[PDB]
Amino acid sequence: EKIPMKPLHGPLYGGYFRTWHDKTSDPTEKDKVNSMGELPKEVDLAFIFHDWTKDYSLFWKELATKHVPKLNKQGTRVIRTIPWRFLAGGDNSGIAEDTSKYPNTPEGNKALAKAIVDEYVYKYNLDGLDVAVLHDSIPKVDKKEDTAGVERSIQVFEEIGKLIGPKGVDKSRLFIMDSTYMADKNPLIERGAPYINLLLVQVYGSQGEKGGWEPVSNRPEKTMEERWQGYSKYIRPEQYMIGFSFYEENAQEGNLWYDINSRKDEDKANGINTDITGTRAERYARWQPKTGGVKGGIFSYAIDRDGVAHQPKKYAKQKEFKDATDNIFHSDYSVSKALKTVMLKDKSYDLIDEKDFPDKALREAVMAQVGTRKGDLERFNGTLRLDNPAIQSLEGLNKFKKLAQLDLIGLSRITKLDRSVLPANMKPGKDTLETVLETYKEPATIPPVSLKVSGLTGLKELDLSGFDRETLAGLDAATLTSLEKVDISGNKLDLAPGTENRQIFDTMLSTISNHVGSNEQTVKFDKQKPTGHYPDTYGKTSLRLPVANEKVDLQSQLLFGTVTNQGTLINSEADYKAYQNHKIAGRSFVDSNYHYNNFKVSYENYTVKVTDSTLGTTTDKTLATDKEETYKVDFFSPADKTKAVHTAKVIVGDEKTMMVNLAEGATVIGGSADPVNARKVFDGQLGSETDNISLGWDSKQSIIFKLKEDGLIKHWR
Amino acid sequence: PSVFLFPPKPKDTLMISRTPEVTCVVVDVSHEDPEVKFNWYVDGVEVHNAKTKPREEQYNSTYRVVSVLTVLHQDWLNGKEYKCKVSNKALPAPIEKTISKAKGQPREPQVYTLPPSREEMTKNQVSLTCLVKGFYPSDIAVEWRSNGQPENNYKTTPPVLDSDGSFFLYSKLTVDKSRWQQGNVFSCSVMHEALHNHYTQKSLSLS
């Protein structure tokens, strides 16, 4: 019966064995000399990819009796691969064809879930189920995509997950899903994320490795990284598994990936290439995500074609070509075993030990939240909660290279805090990891870790020097009772009166004076370099000038301001010189090097639109004031040209009331011009670069129209 | 890499409310170097108002980079040479393709509506015909409409080359016999560059 087997551990290697290449699949076909029992111990998962093989083939007897126990003995699980449409569909849906037996109801899908599992998993005493969510296997009705069928499969997938998998009664059997779709595109990932053990993305060829191309962007899309990136939200990284493909015999265009090494045109006789060097599979074996954690492993397709060389690219055009590779060979599964050992050689799959985290409560908290690998520390970019109070030493937090957030909650026993016992990304930095995939022809920026320190009663020292911290948010100073030393020098902190940082600093400083006084040795907070941002809104919304023969720079006059991350508006250089002289303990915090010019944000590249009283637009900062006029000056960011950041009201001389276009919204009621394009001369906008506002065909065209409102017309344009 | 420049729809070029497009498809694009830079000219006047269409969901095999260009009606009808210069890194030098309107003396389409056959009156449905002959060039569009409301169930034959040199075509409007016998109006709406406002109608009803 169900043989006991050790759980899934380390890097895995999958392999879809094609049934019709088995020797017992069809005795008439004598060329098939392979067997599914010959799969070695290196192969963790052995998927049963069934087609062509007959319904009542001799393979099914050989599978359940001879193969499954042999594989389970050595340590290899057997999994059945059903398509998407077996869960819900009509066209070739196997079990779901009989809709009268298994209806589309709450109870009906629960009966179908059992029927699927029993027929596929438990029938031959297999060790898991696999669902292939592809466009090739998508639920169709009369060779047309079915909307209700896809919505049914989702619900069925949940019910099957209640039977087998992690959240099932029978957890011995695996529940797997394989997908060419991406996370955002595939709809089952959201619903059946907890219900699966492994996800098997199929990314054959350079289209998978390098990613497709976006012509409008002229940049790569759906890359290997971007593929995972979406799935990272839904599943853990150790569940993820990538797929390559071996050469299928007499393969045609649209199914030639050239993953494993091709045949040499010289070597006409030889059609075997067990060498794995310079292959896509070998690179896939070595590939690890840049964030989140290490992958679960890789898998092959048509593992029965292990070691078989790929048909050259030259002969890819000619359909009827009998190459040496198109012959069938008795594979000894050298590549599978080689690629497995390559993944074992990977050092990231080394477990976390006392070397990394001496403290047990920390080491257990990390294992629960983050992961159980050394590589996970280099990658993981999520929250890490250290709420457990019984924690002595935070040694080896520097192992975390890309941690997103760190919560220190109720950790009284902690005393000192410095770069040693904190993440590496306390300060900013670029990506240190290196990819092992091919590409076309810049390392990613690592966000500084968010630090919430609250409830640490027995915390004494606190060093955050040279970390370039933007704020002091998170530091609950009221709970830090036993505080004595502090160091926040060489950061980008706005420590001005009234700021949240100063409130935290003052609450901290009052604790320092009590215990060991306040001085240069205990307290440090010098040489700050606060980040200068753009303000949300602006105050200077008007400007009355004379009718002088002079020119004025509207930008400098109207558009100015450099807010901080806390919220201190520095408008002029004088305001900064005042800011520089925020003396705390008889010395300023701001660096002397960090002048106003280094802090100031540039308002170059900002566009401007000067609408005069007769709605006459002009895009020039240098406004002449020689003529009497009233203006509405709108400013726009280099990013967003449509939405104005600020609007002003310049009035050279006596104010004139701003006119309004009475034609805008005019009811066209005649003229030779086309009524459609006639309305678009009163639309309000000019039009898109590639619009069409041709009034008519003839050179002369007329428009008869009525105004929207009554008024006194003083001007037209 | 192969280039395939295509002309605008006749209906689009003969109606100013609609927007005509000169599509430039590129098939068998290099998988290694998939960068494609399109350059668009109109009698030498290079325009930069094109729009590369998003990569459609072809399964595998060959990249197919489309590039559309919105064009002025007058420019097409005047017969300006729209040139699509494709530029690929794999390609040693750019592939150019040029297209223009059919060059020849335009001719007015004589539009004629024919009623259902005397034999077809026995059937529960009937076929209203619209002959359109003696026109040039082949760029033409035809539409039916019953009592103002645009018709659904009709089909138009391709422009066929006539003996004299002009083209011709028919358009079959399949309707129920009820609406014919009751006495509705059905109007064949031909559209050709050699018409008043590129438009003309011929009504058809029972007698």
Place this chain on the structure above:
Amino acid sequence: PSVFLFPPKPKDTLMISRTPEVTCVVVDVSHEDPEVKFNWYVDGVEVHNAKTKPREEQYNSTYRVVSVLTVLHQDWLNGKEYKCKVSNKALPAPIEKTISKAKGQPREPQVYTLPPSREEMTKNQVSLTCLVKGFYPSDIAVEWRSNGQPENNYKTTPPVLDSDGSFFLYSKLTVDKSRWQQGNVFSCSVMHEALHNHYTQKSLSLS
């Protein structure tokens, strides 16, 4: 080298007196090695009764080796797969092309003759129409004849796909108004596999 297998003329396959041909053109043939060996199969049954056509005038540049095969009518109408296996020395392995009759339930062509339009009666010439609809497959042939004598000046539109799934087409016979008003007979002679003797006529005259 590119191969282009072509079906027989509809008129040839629907008349036993005429002889149908399955042409297999080969273009862009190697200038270096111009030897082309055609192999002809009919559901595997290799036939050896083909005839390589002489090199037509041609305007240099690229060799175009045509190969004709005379076929039995019944074999075509039954829908046997005619396969043209081209073999060139430059070509690494032979290019095969296969063709057969359209697979689906045949349907009878409803033939209807329509007289000239009421408006066209003002013109010195008139257009006699012949609607042919509701037929499948597209393999069809149409001819006019006035008082027995085969007509010269007429044109037939390609088979156009109808809404239901069948095809249809029109045929325009341009004649003088004199012969129409005088009261001659003109007969639209449709020919389709789903007819009696693959043949049917509909006469047309003044009333």
